Design an enzyme around this catalytic site. Structure first.
Site: not given
Ligand SMILES: [Cu+2]
Ligand SMILES: [Zn+2]
Ligand SMILES: [Cu+2]
Ligand SMILES: [Zn+2]
Lengths: 153, 153
Positions: B46, B48, B63, B71, B80, B83, B120, B143
């Site tokens: 993702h 962020h 995000h 999400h 998002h 995403d 992740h 993370r």
């Molecule tokens: Cu993330």
């Molecule tokens: Zn997201």
């Protein structure tokens, strides 16, 4: 306000955090923070064009210079946008940074966000050195630490 | 042709370089590169909100979500902007990332430059997990590595 931040890191002990804040899009940017692990004295401080750290600081490219000017100090009319002059480290190796600049911006098509902030080995001569390298880089020597300038909360 | 790049690093062994290319503004962004040190299988991936690494990956914020949506996966309308779904590591722990996405951009309001790319611990459930966490983070866990996305050439 628009805000940004940069974590400076390198191969040696030089490290720091530099913050940026710009209250108005057409106003000055405040730049402040601290860098440690430096020899006492002046150290060149520039925004380099690319936020590319794939080769550490070496991939950052030249000073950010969208207006195609010669290298200078921050208070010179003739300067690169990325020319932030020198920071000064004390006898304990710490440079406390606290300035304001009206040429860099955190927004617009020419914005320093996403580019690389670099602190150098030696003093930047501010383009007054009297040789070709002076009006290009300021003769500030190697890139000791750097980081990509990122959007902050 | 607009380009960006990101070096991913964390507290553990996960590291890599991710490239971004956008041939035409507002056109799709190609995302590709190699991440090593991952467990075999799926890992959430993702953008962020903040390019803030002052506290490692934790300071990257949530995000990137300028449209205040829930999400989802990259194929969903409800997602998002950040995403990008999952990336897959092979049995040797390498993810040879190859994504094309038309919601992220390298310019304009959906610009991801200056923000943080994060890979992740676990799979992103793409908003299909049936709990509040699923519609916030996709339940992708910690993370493992991150970096600020910078302007490249
Ligand atoms: Cu993330
Ligand atoms: Zn997201
Ligand atoms: Cu420099
Ligand atoms: Zn310069």
């Amino acid at each position: 306000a628009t805000k940004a931040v940069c974590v400076l890191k390198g191969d040696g002990p030089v490290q720091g955090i530099i913050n940026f804040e710009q209250k108005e899009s057409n106003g000055p940017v405040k730049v402040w923070g601290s860098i440690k692990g430096l020899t006492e004295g002046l150290h060149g401080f520039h925004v380099h064009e690319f936020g590319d750290n794939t080769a550490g600081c070496t991939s950052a490219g030249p000073h950010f210079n969208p207006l195609s000017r010669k290298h200078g100090g921050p208070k010179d009319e003739e300067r690169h946008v990325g020319d932030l002059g020198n920071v000064t480290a004390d006898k304990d190796g710490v440079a406390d940074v606290s300035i304001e600049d009206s040429v860099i911006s955190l927004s617009g098509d020419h914005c320093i966000t996403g580019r690389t902030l670099v602190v150098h080995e030696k003093a930047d001569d501010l383009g007054k050195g009297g040789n070709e390298e002076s009006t290009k880089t300021g003769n500030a020597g190697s890139r000791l630490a750097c980081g990509v300038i990122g959007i902050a909360q």
